[PDB]
Amino acid sequence: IIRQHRCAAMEEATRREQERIAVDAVVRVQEQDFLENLARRDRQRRIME
Amino acid sequence: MREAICIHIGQAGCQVGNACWELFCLEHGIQPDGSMPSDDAFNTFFSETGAGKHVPRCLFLDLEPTVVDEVRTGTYRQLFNPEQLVSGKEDAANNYARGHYTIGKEIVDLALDRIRKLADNCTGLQGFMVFHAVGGGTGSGLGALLLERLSVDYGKKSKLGYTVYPSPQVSTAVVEPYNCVLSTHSLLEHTDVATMLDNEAIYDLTRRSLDIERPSYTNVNRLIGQVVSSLTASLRFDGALNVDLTEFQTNLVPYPRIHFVLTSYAPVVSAEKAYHEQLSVADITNSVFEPAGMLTKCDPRHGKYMSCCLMYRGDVVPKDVNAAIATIKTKRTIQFVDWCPTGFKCGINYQPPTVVPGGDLAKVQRAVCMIANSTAIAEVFARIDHKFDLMYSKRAFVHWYVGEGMEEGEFSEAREDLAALEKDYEEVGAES
Amino acid sequence: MREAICIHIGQAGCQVGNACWELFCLEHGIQPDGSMPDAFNTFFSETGAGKHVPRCLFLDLEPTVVDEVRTGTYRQLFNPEQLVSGKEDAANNYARGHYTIGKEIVDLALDRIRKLADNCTGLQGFMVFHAVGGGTGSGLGALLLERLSVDYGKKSKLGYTVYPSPQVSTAVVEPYNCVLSTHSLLEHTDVATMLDNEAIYDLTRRSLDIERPSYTNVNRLIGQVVSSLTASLRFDGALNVDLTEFQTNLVPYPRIHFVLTSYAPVVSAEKAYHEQLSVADITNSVFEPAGMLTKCDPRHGKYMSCCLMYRGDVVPKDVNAAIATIKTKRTIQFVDWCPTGFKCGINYQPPTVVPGGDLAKVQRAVCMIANSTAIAEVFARIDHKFDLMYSKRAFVHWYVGEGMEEGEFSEAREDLAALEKDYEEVGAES
Amino acid sequence: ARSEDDVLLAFFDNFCAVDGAPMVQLTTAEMRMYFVGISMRMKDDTDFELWCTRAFCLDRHPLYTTTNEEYGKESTSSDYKLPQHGRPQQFT
Amino acid sequence: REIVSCQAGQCGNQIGSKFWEVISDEHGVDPTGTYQGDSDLQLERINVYFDESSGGRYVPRAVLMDLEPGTMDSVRAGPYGQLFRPDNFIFGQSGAGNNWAKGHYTEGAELIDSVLDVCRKEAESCDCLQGFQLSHSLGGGTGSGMGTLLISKLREEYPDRIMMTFSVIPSPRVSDTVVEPYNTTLSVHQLVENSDESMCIDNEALYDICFRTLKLTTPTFGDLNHLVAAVMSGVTCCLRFPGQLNSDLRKLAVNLVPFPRLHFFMMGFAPLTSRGSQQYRGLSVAELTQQMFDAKNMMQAADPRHGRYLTASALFRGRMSTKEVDEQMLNVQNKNSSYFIEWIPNNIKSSICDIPPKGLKMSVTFIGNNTCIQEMFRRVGEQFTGMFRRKAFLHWYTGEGMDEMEFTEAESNMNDLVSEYQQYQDATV
Amino acid sequence: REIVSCQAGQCGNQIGSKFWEVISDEHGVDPTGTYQGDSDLQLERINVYFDESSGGRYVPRAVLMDLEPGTMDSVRAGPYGQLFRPDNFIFGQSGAGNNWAKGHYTEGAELIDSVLDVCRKEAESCDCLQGFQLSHSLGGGTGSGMGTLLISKLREEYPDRIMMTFSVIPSPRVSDTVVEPYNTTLSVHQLVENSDESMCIDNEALYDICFRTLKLTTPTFGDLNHLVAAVMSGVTCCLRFPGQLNSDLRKLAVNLVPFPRLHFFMMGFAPLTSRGSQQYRGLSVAELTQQMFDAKNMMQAADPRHGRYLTASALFRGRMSTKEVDEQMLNVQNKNSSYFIEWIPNNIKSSICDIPPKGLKMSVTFIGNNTCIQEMFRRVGEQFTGMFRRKAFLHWYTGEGMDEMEFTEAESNMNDLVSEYQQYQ
Ligand SMILES: Nc1nc2c(ncn2[C@@H]2O[C@H](COP(=O)(O)OP(=O)(O)OP(=O)(O)O)[C@@H](O)[C@H]2O)c(=O)[nH]1
Ligand SMILES: Nc1nc2c(ncn2[C@@H]2O[C@H](COP(=O)(O)OP(=O)(O)OP(=O)(O)O)[C@@H](O)[C@H]2O)c(=O)[nH]1
Ligand SMILES: Nc1nc2c(ncn2[C@@H]2O[C@H](COP(=O)(O)OP(=O)(O)O)[C@@H](O)[C@H]2O)c(=O)[nH]1
Ligand SMILES: Nc1nc2c(ncn2[C@@H]2O[C@H](COP(=O)(O)OP(=O)(O)O)[C@@H](O)[C@H]2O)c(=O)[nH]1
Ligand SMILES: [Mg+2]
Ligand SMILES: [Mg+2]
């Protein structure tokens, strides 16, 4: 039973690793880059106008 | 009957007490709300109430509210009393002077009042169980003050103190040697028996025996709580050779000023390793006497065994107890002091140790805890003395203590007392 | 009581250990999980759980084989310890496996040996399975030989060694490893047994009609031979034999302790049912040069001691009849000073057929381990190999660059010369 | 506070018809009407851009067999019998 | 328990604004003041930095204070400007004009009384005040002199409290004023005398991290301030969140300050990776320790190899083990034993807290007292002496009321501090 | 056990990237870095080449370098380019200009500090580093110079670790540069001491293989990279998968290097067949042996009849029986004792691995330390002497701080290496 419990704990650790994969893939900097892309684009457009 | 009152002082004390009390509750079958669904075995740790609820005979202290508030917000909040859970407003912060002179006195009176309220209930109080690491300011200062008050107001009741001394290699403070040297004086004079609990030994034991790459503070506290439960189960459960607090402290303390004792618990084996080995009594005794299985960074071969006590739990029989003792005596690798021929204490219990869910330990037929007074403590005392003296050469981290309200000569007094400890150890261990 | 401690070194050691422990579990009815759904006391150490841990120690320098064992079917049977390997292989280097990379694991190996020894109270001896062709099986094996001899004294020591073939080989430094290893195999092995792959392949091709012989079949046959040799103390018999019992009658002199092996009948399922596998027939098949496990013709040498161990429904009646027939026919010759030359063991437990294997279930079988002068031929072959490859210092730099002295090649070659000389001397007539 | 399903249902309820049937046919006109509704919902241009990019992501075994495994590959539990001619009862 | 912050000068105001942004993000507090955090731990010790209102709004325990009304208007119009209490916005009419004397004797002197009134107002509401933290830059006029006046008054009023000071040390490679040596020399002695810890930030190293470590193409002042904001968030992590090994301001003071005047520190925030190499690199504690002590991760511009660490302390965030946080710490102590002073073995303290920064798996903040912190002080005293030899840019101070004797005393204290740093570098046991 | 790899130059970068592609496919690692294999054995020893990040993403333990960033951009844009780590994409601003001097003394020397920093970081990450692998071409400037300085520093930092190099050696028939002899002479004289084992790959022989053995109309550098990546996988297969007769780097070195400086191996792979002939080929151990031992299959432009085999190694992969490989080796030795060396009978080692490469019944790789490897060294030495008697292109190489006398050293080092092979020839 302890063997099965430790295997379940290892599976839970793997699930935690997958969740940390999810949060790492989440890891906003790219979104700020997109926002500044829009910023430089529209400043360029205003400059042309 | 046979009550034992637990005090957990400081951050380290509270964390180790958490694991110790979870182990006590699991082994006594007490739910976290404080009830036993389905025998006066808990009487030493839990006070039975009229409503049917069991309240532990514990007192948590810390000048910083973090650990006590974590306990209050934890699962065992219903178990633990709203009182006996004292908190401060600002921590000692690695300052024995703070913990002993300025912020310790504003809380020591309440601590003594709570201790009185927990002791007048007790009718057969065996003694006190003080868990505190001397590295911290409140573990050293507040612990020292509380020990002084308890000793002066409670007579000669037995007092065991589990202390996590500054480990010789790894440490988490620079003022920690100062705190250890300062608190050693009080711990010597007022604590009846002291138990070494340094960190490298426990951590290496967990790395090698338990085969886990991340041994952490929870695992260390779990092991320490297992040791405490093994030591104190003799009065909790019926055994072939019952020993009480006085019973083993008399056999463990040869002289009043030498009571510091080494500890080693085994079989401390990994779950995977558990059923692939024939854990016999002789095998576990040999594993305990192996230096690698000790929970203190003091190798026995550099010292002299003086008086060793073995707490056996499980299906152990006096047969195998005596056979293991005979084999250990025949082995020449370990050496006992000449003037103490027997040098062996044995206490047998039929209650096997219990393993908490999620713990690294594995439940076994039998186990044994070694508590031994030996000369090996002199070397760790010398290591911390060398840790301290070169720092004290030109007053490093001393203005804090000077301005906090401590006289400068107290450091020299603590240095001299510690040096007296090593010299007394050497004198007693010297051959007749 | 009568425990035999198995130690398996290197690639071949681990493979033969897997095969022999499969056979032992088959014989004693022990699950791969280690259970029966005390004739096993010699190989399986009882614990409290009724599960039986084999009295074995697997040692290797590279983790592939130990990982495979820990992942395979017998993971729950074999102890998590006693199954140890280093981090880097000896890499066909006797010097590496004996001086540099094996020294950091010999201490743990002897710790595990102590753990095996203090568990048993009636240790009959040690049995090391290895091949001297490779690096670890030669060097680490030799080092364990010295440590076992110095730590145990006159305890019985069987080595089942796969020497390099006289005709083909799977390495170029294999002759160097074999020559460097024979020194230890002569000074600290009480009985050494020749198990090269040639005669096993030939026997498999000519008897079992196997078009694709493999290490699997070779190791199965080796395990059959080991089980036949060890079953005398495991099961009752009319004429039981023990380790010392057969050693004292197999080795006439301390330096003459290398033995050939021949197991028969060894036939497939189709062929086994067309033959009268009687005692005389199986004895003749054993003494046939085709049936041996090592490529070494008896007719070119002289026999001095044959230990014949029969299993099954054999009887001393037909045993003596077969011995008389062997004496009568002159195609084989025995040495002048040893008229009897026969040590006979009888066991009532017939060899268990390995399911999914190649052997056929046979009522009676017999394994013969023989000390004879014919080993001079294979020693001459291996020493001519060593001299030819050592004349102009081939691969010697690899050996030397591992804290190794170039002169022990020469002293080992002198040891081979002395061994061949003493075999010739003992085989010389009066 | 809620889940993905809760957010999806809350967002799709705004596009339901008067009678309550889940309407599934949208066009660019009402898409842009929803967009301008959000535009007046929050007036900061940077926050509107962040909301839109955040909600739409604008620019974001038979093969392998072991000969060592072949050892115990075929043997089963039915082939494990204790030896018939075992050693006699231990009198020691 | 409760800690209260004061922001002085333009640089201090902006660094404090982004610091409050980071704290609000960590504690789940919206710019509108309402709570939106994921769990209860963010509310358990939210009173350390914030104060609750009747309506549930969490107003930061902050005093935003500076002569120039422009910075007040900018920070109030900023994204989190509605979070602060308007009565905590204290500002004058005319700016100090990068004049230490103007900020300390003439313009800031009249307004420091009201600043002290609002600071005592905010402190009396605290159940148990842990201390103050002043965010400022020593290169400015009102951000250095008037901030030092604040620190002096706070020392005179609250003796036992801890005044952290986060001072942005000016550097001529990133020079913005021809009076920075004067301001720094006049402010460092006050920082030594009054502030319990004075933590140095070098804008050179800020740009160095933003270039060679974070690989930011155009790291603005916001990107510069994120690192210091993370440092200020991590320095007080164990106060606000539970951990396996707690610590606080007094912990760090006692375990990092061996002598009363040796209380200047240099910071390090780890991990720090580029945008592309974020998920590629294994965010493990081994890589954390590897990036811990190197100069490129340190946001103070003085190479630590030229000096010896008097003391160090690492405050870790995240779920990590002791055999992953301390044994390798001793391994570093051994493999760079030359750079650690021999008379204090185990120069480095470890502290662990459970809650990591939002988004990041694990982190650590470095607080280190090293002999190399005197490089800035020597190499700014050189410029101060060069300018003061010819009495350049001095008529402003003399007219405001400063005598040259005060400048001589300031340089004497400069030399005393650099000598004290030096005579612990080559010392032998 | 784990092996850390490096790619130098444009040739080395392309071929190493393709090797990483085939290894990722073999171990079931998609370009996203995750594992989607169909066995336990794939993850059992995936740490040999891949290092797990904090997320379990398996970053290749590879260091990619070239003075030109164009090949860095190309390898990044490749389908598996996202698998690697950006910090290992170390490169310069100015190219080597096809100059060994620039690649070894001026630009490569100034760029090698970060290179060794990355390599030692990978070594520290490694638990028990089996060896360093390098892949490059001796005919280029940055590949050859950069790689030679690599092997030098790697040897001086880790003496006992196994140094494998995959050197693409130019041939006169397929030469596409005028300074291949200069670069190769200045590189082989470093490879002959600093590298534990070197394996030479010929574009001419690769083209011949693709033309005739594969019957493929238009293979490319991609197909040549296929052919050499199969070799790279097969040489270290036994370090990643179990087998009846396992092997590793040091086993190959000790069994194939009779004398310290004879470690230039000529390679071959099997089986290779076209689509039309795949159904006609009856794959077996004997067929593998003959199609391995024939000259046309080996990608060395050196005829085996012109030389004798010092040592040979056959790393077989797949489900097979050892009796037939033993028969094949013994029979080939007996029937071609003329092709083998008399004073080392049984010149051929055989290793068997259970896991085959995907796409075949079973396969084999050939390590050949044949004495005919001296042919290309002799011909390129003749090229170098012809140029260096008339002082051709010397000013470009000497302007980078170098002088005449190291070319004079290199030509003599090649010459006496050729003489050493000739002695056993
Ligand atoms: N065995 C063990 N040791 C601990 C534990 N917690 C802390 N320690 C060690 O004990 C030493 C003293 O504890 P501190 O961290 O100073 O906490 P404290 O003793 O309550 O003192 P303050 O922090 O001022 O409240 C630390 O340096 C730790 O290394 C624990 O749970 N178990
Ligand atoms: N009969 C038999 N012999 C084997 C087997 N495996 C390896 N060998 C022997 O091992 C010799 C080659 O040596 P290696 O391949 O180096 O194996 P080793 O001797 O254990 O040395 P290592 O590879 O370092 O472990 C061959 O000549 C075989 O005789 C096997 O499964 N059965
Ligand atoms: N970190 C950081 N530093 C700044 C910022 N703005 C200005 N500084 C620094 O502050 C210095 C000038 O301080 P100043 O604003 O004149 O101080 P004040 O006049 O007293 O308010 C310059 O050297 C800048 O390097 C900012 O947003 N962040
Ligand atoms: N087999 C093979 N050879 C290549 C490949 N790419 C280039 N080469 C050869 O390498 C030589 C040029 O080497 P180069 O990459 O320019 O070396 P570098 O300048 O040092 O990087 C040419 O003669 C090609 O024949 C490839 O992908 N495969
Ligand atoms: Mg604390
Ligand atoms: Mg091997």
Side-chain angles (χ1 to χ4, degrees), chain B residues 156-206:
Chain B
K156 289 182 178 180
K157 293 182 183 293
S158 81
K159 291 177 70 68
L160 294 175
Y162 285 74
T163 302
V164 178
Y165 277 64
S167 82
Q169 293 179 356
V170 298
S171 295
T172 61
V174 290
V175 181
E176 165 166 5
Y178 284 74
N179 301 314
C180 176
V181 179
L182 288 175
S183 51
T184 304
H185 182 74
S186 66
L187 197 150
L188 167 76
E189 52 205 290
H190 291 297
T191 300
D192 186 74
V193 166
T195 297
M196 295 299 102
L197 292 188
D198 57 35
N199 270 309
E200 293 83 3
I202 308 170
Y203 271 104
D204 288 331
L205 184 146
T206 318

Side-chain angles (χ1 to χ4, degrees), chain C residues 356-407:
Chain C
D358 44 9
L359 277 296
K361 186 180 289 293
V362 61
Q363 293 82 17
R364 61 198 74 86
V366 57
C367 169
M368 196 257 268
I369 62 170
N371 191 318
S372 163
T373 79
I375 297 169
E377 170 166 359
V378 298
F379 276 143
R381 296 294 86 193
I382 195 66
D383 71 40
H384 163 92
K385 203 42 191 163
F386 179 71
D387 298 0
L388 202 62
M389 218 186 261
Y390 195 54
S391 175
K392 65 178 72 66
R393 303 293 183 270
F395 312 97
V396 187
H397 78 81
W398 275 115
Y399 281 101
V400 168
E402 294 294 328
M404 211 275 278
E405 315 295 333
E406 191 267 334

Side-chain angles (χ1 to χ4, degrees), chain A residues 11-43:
Chain A
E11 173 75 7
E12 154 189 19
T14 59
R15 193 265 303 160
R16 168 76 265 178
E17 291 176 300
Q18 300 291 70
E19 190 186 300
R20 167 213 41 64
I21 292 294
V23 307
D24 285 331
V26 162
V27 173
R28 288 77 50 73
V29 185
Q30 67 275 23
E31 211 64 48
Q32 283 324 290
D33 169 60
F34 186 45
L35 183 63
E36 65 183 1
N37 207 356
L38 277 296
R40 66 184 183 272
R41 204 262 292 160
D42 72 12
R43 183 179 63 83

